[PDB]
């Protein structure tokens, strides 16, 4: 009853249709293909960010398709003897083709197909050559479909990626709101949760998760619900996960991708900031409207602005606002200090910048906060590492990219140093100025700072 | 489903060479005996992956009357010590004894690693055994050995010299006629339609390698089948039309460029305001070389290939690049500035070499070396001593000992004064295109294009806005429009929430009040000093 | 001869660029004439022309500057 099926896959409809159109029809009835004349594809590659569900799709296809199925763990074909790996691979392919119009699945083939060129060894080169010649060559295929799955497909031989071996590279991307709702519905099919939960809302708040994190959230909610009955631990039949448990699990959980960049942040709310009402309102609108009402933006036919810069004398509320957003914002937050992304190695700073920005856009919608922007982006004029990094930032921020949703918040107190290119509209258009407090602002900040403290009534603020 | 010489196209000279070599000695050795000199007895087929080497091999094997023996490269060696050499000897002796047969080895680069870089003694022993067997004393008589590899560079020169593999037939990428022939061959077996322009499809297809043409045909067939998804008397009427041909063509990309393909936003020439001269020049430059080669040949000189964009940030260099990518008839490659640099020694030069090689192979291609400032400084306490080497690599690859068939280089930058003088030399980046800040007409056009698809009230005065804004840029105008849109959406949201709360299309178009409020705090993006610097740099070259 | 006399700081690369630009202008004119002729239906310019060369001269440029070339003279003087 626990066997995974096609219904168990959610948040991927186009990819599932693409897989089925070439996995089922040839095995279901090849009469139409024979009438057309041209053979269908006989090789597919699944690639995407880790934990998207490619292995789950492979398992479902294996456990549903009637035809014989065979599996090959990538770093498992190799053997200590000399030439035994090729023997194992050839025997596997031969028996697979002999048995029936079967399916062969290779998991993480990037560990056994190292591009055949950059590798310095010989066993891996021989194995990749054997694989190439075995899939393509004389006596090519007895109606046998091959499959592959790699989290990163760049490190694969171009000959392998060429048509005839791995032609259709279906991209299993990150889900959307509807996909997350479907995944939650699938995962919560075996829980007597409640009569008041609204999984749609939980899906809405859940932004950067990739299905595996949805499963983690559900498991954590179940653990919290069972722990809530510790005092009583009539109990087996009374267990149930409630909206409160889901709220707690959602608050605790974080997306897997941003796990490497998790940092403690003080809990400060809007009330903790005195004055700056206009700035707070503008920022709230900026960070909420694109994620809350994309339909209106689509109707108006214009993408929203995504940049704001904070500049002013030190000690006015810039980092305070950044903390407030990281705490009370729906979107994921990434905090990076100015020179954190600099390394002595040649080009590793650019690699770090590209990695951080790729992770941010992948986990979007997220707000990226830069501190000491004057430090990171020096003006233009040790090998020009500063020039290279500023150029990399500029080009990856406003280059040939879809720029899905990454809000950049800039904090600094030396605006003149920053080159004019960064401050161009479209990157950091909004130039918010935070001046020294006036009388009303001083009163408000004093009240906020004395909100929770024993103060005598005689005190005059 | 037998495959013969009639099932291969796009390679006439190479096919003729292989055909005559494999036939003449076999069909009659009398003529060669009369001449006296024995014919060659070895050939190596080298070229990019998926060009047709294995197809040629299997066609010759299945059509020739002489016995054929096949030896997969990574198949001879076995666990027992000293067994690969025994297997090779047994194969060769059996083949020679059987008949004047032909030997075919596939991917022999896996069994002949140059005899120098290889470490394991088994590889050295097997390569030496192959060499000795091919060239020894009274070794062979009336036998021909074929080969097929993707990396001929990594082969032993002793094995490549005359007598073992003397001729290296180059099975390269086809041309327009070759693609037309390949498409005819692939589509002959299927009932396609009564209205198809295979000539037009071949013209559109540029960087494909035959295997990709087969992939395109398969995709077209699949789209035709899916067009009957709702229906599924159908098999008889099944056909593929110009619609699914165009769909598959739009989705098709060459196999070589699968590594460096990145999605880009959709944009069209109507989306860019002004810049009529730049648009016309780019269109002509990218069209004429790949559209009227006959006129260029008749006149007798190759045309310009490189172009560079320099101007204040916020003028539309990246927009023009996107427009080229979306509305070009040639393959587009996007490379960022420092994406080709790595900490290892010389690997940056290796990456540069391989990217230029990919561009040449997939020609006609347009390279967008974004941020030439980052890519190449002027010259040289060096920071690792690699920037100079990379710059020299770029210079020599762009203009060195090469034919430079068709590769257009486009450079976008905003600090031309930190560019090495060599790059600006004619023949590399001859076309220096300057993009000034928009004038009145250009600003009006930019605003109109930006507001092309959006509900805008008639009270707005685009001419008035253009007159009011003088030094602004395209980015500034886009930001103003975005501010107006955000204000309109905020008004809509507050009105909707108020109405819903009271109960428990207020604004269909952005309005004059919204534009006034948005423009209330518009800011310029490029300073007078910076624009003066750009104009001075332009003048020092124009005055030349 | 007149073009060479007028151009002083140009180099072989610049002259080749001027010739290529003249060729491109000639091809543009020829193709425009051919397409217009075909459109009205449903070798006008067999040789490159003085107007084409004049346009190339108009928007040509110099590859290197005197301040830049001074360095080679200085290096030669050093030895
Ligand atoms: N699209 C999805 N629909 C339902 N469950 C999913 C989906 N993607 C992932 N999961 C769940 O998360 C797990 C992680 O995905 P999985 O297939 O193991 O990917 P991988 O092997 O790349 O780590 C799955 O085993 C399944 O329990
Ligand atoms: N308006 C304010 N409301 C509340 N606390 C404030 C305010 N302005 C300054 N502070 C306090 O002073 C500190 C300094 O301000 P902050 O935003 O961190 O500036 P910076 O990052 O330049 O040092 C804050 O972290 C906070 O503790
Ligand atoms: N010249 C050609 N004419 C027709 N089909 C071709 C041609 N070249 C390649 N193809 C098709 O594309 C495939 C690619 O050639 P192939 O023999 O697989 O080369 P390789 O050994 O490099 O993988 C062929 O198997 C065939 O299906
Ligand atoms: N001529 C123009 N017409 C319309 N929009 C323009 C124009 N020029 C610039 N823009 C807008 O300004 C943005 C910035 O220009 P862009 O091409 O990206 O330059 P850059 O690469 O220097 O940042 C464009 O993405 C576009 O939104
Ligand atoms: F993590 Be999965 F195997 F892509
Ligand atoms: F003192 Be703050 F960081 F400007
Ligand atoms: F891709 Be083939 F083997 F040249
Ligand atoms: F802002 Be652009 F890249 F000049
Ligand atoms: Mg997996
Ligand atoms: Mg091959
Ligand atoms: Mg740019």
Residue numbers in the entry:
A (entry chain C): 198 to 430, 440 to 587, 593 to 672
B (entry chain B): 199 to 430, 440 to 587, 591 to 714, 726 to 765
C (entry chain A): 673 to 714, 726 to 762
Original paper wording:
The p97 AAA+ATPase is an essential and abundant regulator of protein homeostasis that plays a central role in unfolding ubiquitylated substrates. The other structure adopts a helical conformation, displays substrate running in an extended conformation through the pore of the p97 hexamer, and resembles structures reported for other AAA unfoldases. These findings support the model that p97 utilizes a “hand-over-hand” mechanism in which two residues of the substrate are translocated for hydrolysis of two ATPs, one in each of the two p97 AAA ATPase rings.
The five helical subunits (A–E) are well-ordered in both D1 and D2 rings. In contrast, subunit F is pulled away from the peptide-binding groove, makes relatively open interfaces with its neighboring A and E subunits, and has poorly resolved density. For both D1 and D2, the helical interfaces are stabilized by binding of ADP⋅BeFx (ATP) at active sites that, as expected, are formed primarily by residues of the first subunit and completed by a pair of arginine residues from the second subunit. All six N domains adopt the ‘up’ position. The substrate-bound subunits (A–E) are related to each other by an ~60° rotation and ~6.5 Å translation. This matches the helical symmetry of dipeptides in a canonical β-strand conformation. Correspondingly, the peptide density is fit well by a β-strand, with successive substrate dipeptides making equivalent interactions with successive p97 subunits through both the D1 and D2 pores. Pore loop 1 and pore loop 2 residues of both D1 and D2 contribute to substrate binding, with the tightest interactions apparently formed by the pore loop 1 residues Leu278-Ala279 from D1 and Trp551-Phe552 from D2.
